[PDB]
Ligand binder design. Sequence first.
Ligand SMILES: [Ca+2]
Ligand SMILES: [Ca+2]
Ligand SMILES: [Ca+2]
Ligand SMILES: [Ca+2]
Ligand SMILES: [Ca+2]
Ligand SMILES: [Ca+2]
Ligand SMILES: [Ca+2]
Ligand SMILES: [Ca+2]
Ligand code: NA
Lengths: 343, 343, 342, 343
Amino acid sequence: DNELFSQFKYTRLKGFDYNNGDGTISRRDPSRPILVNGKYYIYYTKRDTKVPPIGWNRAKEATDEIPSTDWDLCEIWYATSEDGTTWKEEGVAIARPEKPKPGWRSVATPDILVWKGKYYLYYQAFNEPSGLRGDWCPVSVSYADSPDGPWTHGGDSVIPFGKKGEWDQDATHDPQPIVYKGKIHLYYKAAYNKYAVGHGLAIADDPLGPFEKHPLNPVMTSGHETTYFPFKEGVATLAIKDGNERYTMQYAKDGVNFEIASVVSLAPTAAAPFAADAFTDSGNGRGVTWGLCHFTNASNNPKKGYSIIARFDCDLSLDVDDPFYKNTGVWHRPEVYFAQAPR
Amino acid sequence: DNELFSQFKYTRLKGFDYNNGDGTISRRDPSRPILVNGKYYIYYTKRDTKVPPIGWNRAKEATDEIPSTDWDLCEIWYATSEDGTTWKEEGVAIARPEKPKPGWRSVATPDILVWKGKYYLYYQAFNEPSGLRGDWCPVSVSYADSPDGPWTHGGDSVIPFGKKGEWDQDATHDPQPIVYKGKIHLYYKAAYNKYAVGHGLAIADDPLGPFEKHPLNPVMTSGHETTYFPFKEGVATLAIKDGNERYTMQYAKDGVNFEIASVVSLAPTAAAPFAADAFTDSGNGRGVTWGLCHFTNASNNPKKGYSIIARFDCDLSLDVDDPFYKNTGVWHRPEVYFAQAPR
Amino acid sequence: DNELFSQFKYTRLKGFDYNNGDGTISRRDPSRPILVNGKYYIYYTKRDTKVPPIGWNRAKEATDEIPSTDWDLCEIWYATSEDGTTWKEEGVAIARPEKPKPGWRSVATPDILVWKGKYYLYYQAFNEPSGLRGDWCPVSVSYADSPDGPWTHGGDSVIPFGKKGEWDQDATHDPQPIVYKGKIHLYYKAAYNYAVGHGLAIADDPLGPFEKHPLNPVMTSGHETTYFPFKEGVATLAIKDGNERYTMQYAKDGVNFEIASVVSLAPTAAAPFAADAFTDSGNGRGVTWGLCHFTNASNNPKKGYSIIARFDCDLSLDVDDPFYKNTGVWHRPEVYFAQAPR
Amino acid sequence: DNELFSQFKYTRLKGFDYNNGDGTISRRDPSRPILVNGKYYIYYTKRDTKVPPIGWNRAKEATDEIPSTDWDLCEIWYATSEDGTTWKEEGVAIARPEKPKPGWRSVATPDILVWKGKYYLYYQAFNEPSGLRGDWCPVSVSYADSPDGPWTHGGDSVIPFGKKGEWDQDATHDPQPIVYKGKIHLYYKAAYNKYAVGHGLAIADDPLGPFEKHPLNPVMTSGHETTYFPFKEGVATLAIKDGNERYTMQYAKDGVNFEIASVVSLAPTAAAPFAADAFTDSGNGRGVTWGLCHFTNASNNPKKGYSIIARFDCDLSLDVDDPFYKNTGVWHRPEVYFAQAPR
Ligand SMILES: [Ca+2]
Ligand SMILES: [Ca+2]
Ligand SMILES: [Ca+2]
Ligand SMILES: [Ca+2]
Ligand SMILES: [Ca+2]
Ligand SMILES: [Ca+2]
Ligand SMILES: [Ca+2]
Ligand SMILES: [Ca+2]
Ligand code: NA
């Protein structure tokens, strides 16, 4: 049967503290891990703030200490691990720059590119507390000679928005590049129109750009989030629609035209698969068995919101056939049901 | 928005003890509640045994004290409630009869009928430890003048099995009668053929039989279990496949030809909705907002397995419209994911 | 000259066809006759099948049409007679119920009770082909206002089995009721240990409940027995399969049986007529005739069937017939030549 | 598993005609076979008369041509066989002698002795139609060098009767000799007294006599008839009673004091086992597996009576163990029962 079908199993990470879950510390949107000198490295949004987020709808009340949303007032931090489950949080990778440089308010939602022996982080740059009035968080890039720092600012707004009226015109969220067909292929997302969510491709020969939009964008018309990895000579994705249990693996022979390969369930949010060959230009993608993800509803109390990062394992790999991941049913214990309570 | 689409929310019952979940006490397959004179009544399988079940596969080790399965060595008990959430367990309703009368080994999986001023319980009747040979638990019926006792035995094997080769040659599980078009409409189930589970219908004018099968059986061809209630001029049903996240409401203008009406999720197992008009012959079925259900994975430890009964609420009612139950998404908390661990 | 000693003489019945003995038709375990409106009535297992039994050993190959044993796929039929020798087979008395009601597969081995002017048939009820081989055939009861039926199902498993490990645990075969000390006294048999016991089960109501006599097994050997009221007690003929060892036994109180006589060539599945079987007279007069069967009617074991037959005797207080009181048996040479070498 | 316990199986003989069984030809009381020069030899009463016997109670009317009883007007004939089942009747062995020599009227009931290279026949010698009445048929002996003839008369009345009043005073029936402890041990029968049947022993060093009675006669006090063979260092015996199924195997360690060794059924009448060591003085008797016997009720009609000879087989041998002969049950077909008819 189907090489892009799998189940997902979850493991709590070791090594990250969250002030006992009081909403003042949050880690989310981890990057796909890379392996360098026998350590995995990951980069993620990290918030550490005096008070938990005050709410989108109250972005008015945010100050330089009080965040409006979970991703406001953040930096990008990084961690190393030998086995992918126990992590050591190392320190800041991307600090917010000085006001009013883009990002001065928050840098968030990173992903990694390895290119010609240097390391590049792409991430969203915020200039105002999120939720006022409408966003504008274009993508910045920084770079380094080492997976540890130090990191040097590279550019701001490095993915062009679209001309007025295009689907593309206000956003390039979640930048995520792979190396495909000898070029940097960077996927990203934008809500448009009853809003829908598109995914686009932007291509460059230079990590600092320029990046040019693919003429078929939006390459996908469905899916609140997606994550991509080289697979055979194409590109596979996991696609999620937020809140419903319709999750699909999709596959494009050309990295561009996507067709459903499988329907999966309980799939990770902000999934960040490890793939040895993400940046390798194989033409021969082997697929994946583990990576990181997040949960944004870590707290019970929505006035003390935070997120945590977590690990998933799966079998979406050509070099592994593990029937433990190939069952077709899901069984929840009664507590899961009692957590869906009446009013 | 669809009058047969709904979310399901769950409430822990009060009033039932399970010897701290050690596997010696189990309650499962509750009947649909009936309201008689300001009190709800339910009837349910109850096991209370010196030791937990030894296993299907070890049925040959079962004794008069050691059960093979969760439903072995059981009687049908009953309970009453004013509000449907706090219950008082009253005592036995159907005791196991003297060996070797059918049911002497276990009686289980009850459902209730109100007919011409009398109460009827239909249940499966076991003659040996379950799993020992091939099954064989035909349906018996007992009746009473009051929803309290006492119950008088009425008949054994009141639903006929099909001729050798036919789909229901071996079983009529989960008997569930409604009053429809002036007659007792008794739905039931049987596994056949990779094996499918059918549902059939049998009909009578005397609760004690004869029942005769209905052309078109199996009336459904899908779903490990189903529960039926009068809806408008027809009959609606919830249909569950064990293990997967895709459940459906289905509707049959005539009680026989059923078509999808909605797709739902996290739906209750062994659902037993209260419907004031279940037995009323009204031709105008109003739908349901609550009932009982069960969880057979109550224990963390499968060598000490037991089930509990629980309550669900929903809006599958024509007489109520509750936006709380009418969302389309489901959000689980991280512990739901961490309970799907790797090996 | 012992009133419970007798020889047995046999007469071929008239009236019953067996498809020329090809194994497809069989009749056996007849009920003790009763006399109602100047006719005798008997009830018996009847098989009428497309093919003879394939054997217990092959029960797995039995189907809806193919029987495993001689008593599989059977009904209880009945016949009437004026003289007890010429019979008219009348039709079905007990039909098999719809699957999966107990007995749907076969009903067999009936005996009759007359109680308060109604008629009761007790018989074994089978749910799967015999020899399959977890043998479970508890006793059902049906009743009628007339010996001619129609019959109404009265109850399944009306004689309780014993608790695990008791001799009684798995069977109540051959239920046979008499009326005794104003109660229904029902004798039945169970294999155990194999020994074969006979228990007594007592009731005030033919549909039950039946309670086991506190001292069962009441009798400890005899692969098969039959009972009639006698003086103030109960006499029995006790038979063992194969060996020609047969006893009449007697119990003052119907419970404690003592050997009264050794008899030979006794009838199998013996069903004597006793006008007082159900009369509660406390003065049992004993018997002179009845029905019996032979299970080895066919020369060929792949074409097995049984037939019903008549025996005559003097086991009566109202008759002293010396023709039945001789002590030797002489067989003609054919009988010897029928025990051939290999 | 008793060495003297056994079933008997019967075989119809080939070679003897009885005029379609019209009562005019009769063969009975065969001798134990002997094996000489690759052939078995038997000797037996043979009647061949113009009309059947008119009966004991009509002996007054018997003539030189009309016999009173089955054994009246007989001679002793002989037959040979290679297999024990197909026989060739060879001719007269003992002819009636000239009147009034004893036996002129009839010679009957023979048995054989092989002593010191010669063959001896003992048999009862009658002088008047049986039932005339007053039975007096003492035992004569004749001898030969070949089991074929010619035979020479040896003596009359060679077994002494008892003095008046002794159990023995009137008869020595069914003479049957064995060689035991270097001497001829000849068993015989006599009715005495409520009239019982004894069996006696008489001993001799010479086949022509004198024979001396055993002090303990009657050595056996039951049994209408008996037949004896060397068994171990004793003598075994089948004892028959007329009509009933009380047949016993008995054993006497010393050939004199007999004890019940088994109860058997359907045993042969006038049984005549072959025993290779009957005359061999072994002190080591092996027992028997086959022989001859008779049926005196060959005819359905008592006004046309005759007997026939037959073969039995059995396992009453120390040198054979045959479980076919070793079951304890007898099953008769229905016709056997219907032949016990009422009146
Ligand atoms: Ca991401
Ligand atoms: Ca794989
Ligand atoms: Ca149910
Ligand atoms: Ca509604
Ligand atoms: Ca009987
Ligand atoms: Ca008498
Ligand atoms: Ca002889
Ligand atoms: Ca032997
Ligand atoms: Na009916």
